[model samples]
Target: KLPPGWEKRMFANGTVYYFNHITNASQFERPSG
Candidate 1:
């Protein structure tokens, strides 16, 4: 699962993955995916 303030997403093709943090958030993504 993604870390706090982080979110996971998939493109329409479902070939690409994304992990993004909130706007101006202090937290970040985890060390591992």
Candidate 2:
């Protein structure tokens, strides 16, 4: 969900995406329990 000067970085262990066109962003990780 990024278009202008795309930027994103999330870490609890997984998932990173910065898209302008073409996206099906879904990578679910379960841990730290």
Candidate 3:
């Protein structure tokens, strides 16, 4: 499950990430450059 005040975001290369509002941090499903 996702954390509270968190959400998923989509990228142009079909990547997805998890973002936290409280922390202003983001996590990717996989590493990217």
Candidate 4:
């Protein structure tokens, strides 16, 4: 499962990215923590 404030979104290249809505931080890879 994903983090509480974070979510997975799709990029224009059709790849999945991890984004944080609460912290205002984002990453190209999934965060396990």
Top candidate (TM-score): 4
Candidate order by decreasing TM-score = 4, 3, 1, 2
RMSD to the hidden true structure, all candidates: 5.6, 11.1, 5.8, 1.6
For model 2, give the 10-residue run with minimal summed lDDT. 24-33
Full-model lDDT for every candidate:
0.47, 0.39, 0.70, 0.82
lDDT of 3 by residue, 1-33 (tens): 676767787789998887777778788763221
The 10 consecutive residues of candidate 4 with the worst lDDT sum are 24-33
Score candidate 2 by lDDT. 0.39
Task: Residues 1-33, candidate 2: write the lDDT tens digits.
Answer: 334434454556685644222343323332121
Compared with the true structure, what per-residue lDDT tens digits does model 4 show for residues 1-33? 887788987889898889888887888877865
Please give the RMSD of candidate 1 to the true structure: 5.6
TM-scores of the models, in the given order?
0.34, 0.20, 0.51, 0.58
lDDT of 4 at 20: 85
> Which regions in candidate 1 have their CA more than 4 angstroms from the true location?
24-33
Candidate 3 lDDT (Cα, 0 to 1)? 0.70
